[PDB]
Design a protein around this ligand. Structure first.
Ligand SMILES: [Mg+2]
Length: 135
RNA sequence: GUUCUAUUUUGUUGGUUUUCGGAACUGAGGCCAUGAUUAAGAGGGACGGCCGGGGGCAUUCGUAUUGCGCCGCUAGAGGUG
């Protein structure tokens, strides 16, 4: 909880891994390595109902809690790594991703570079479902 | 040329060998305007440069998965209308 950075000269960089499933949203801030983490709070930790854990309100509260816990240490800027369900399943991020990103941007985390770290397979295994699908 | 032979014939009775004709075999010729229709918008094949997720064998790469090992923080994570 002690920042060695000079205040006006530069900012301390971290990176958030915004995981956006269709049933929950993870907002996870780690360092430049990713091995050491800083703050992780979810939509289910903020809203105690399973059906709206991936809701933009829950992702917004999770992003506000992440930004407050990160300003408690003094990391100022965050790179953004958007991550989806991935694999054989869906590759489009959920509704909480843009809400959490805009929420941390309003709460005051300096936006670095944004990229997709979605685990898009080259050629995956068999998708969970029948030959007729999830009807 | 070789073998066989219907017989006409030597005035009439007999043999042998020829001229002349028919059957088979066999050598040197002369001639054909000498002799093989075209190459199917039929087909087969050779040859040339290709072309192609065609086939078989060996090798190599890519991610994702799931499981394990180590590290960081955590009370939720999955999943559904
Ligand atoms: Mg079924």
């Amino acid at each position: 909880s002690l920042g060695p950075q000079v205040a006006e000269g530069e900012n301390v960089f971290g990176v958030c891994h915004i995981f956006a499933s269709f049933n929950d949203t993870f907002v996870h801030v780690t360092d430049l390595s990713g091995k050491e983490t800083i703050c992780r709070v979810t939509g289910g930790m903020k809203v105690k109902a399973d059906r709206d854990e991936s809701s933009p309100y829950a992702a917004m509260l999770a992003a506000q809690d992440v930004a407050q816990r990160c300003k408690e240490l003094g990391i100022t800027a965050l790179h953004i790594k958007l991550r989806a369900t991935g694999g054989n399943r869906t590759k489009t991020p959920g509704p909480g991703a843009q809400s959490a990103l805009r929420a941390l941007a309003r709460s005051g985390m300096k936006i670095g570079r944004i990229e997709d770290v979605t685990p898009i397979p080259s050629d995956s295994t068999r998708r969970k479902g029948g030959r007729r699908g999830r009807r």
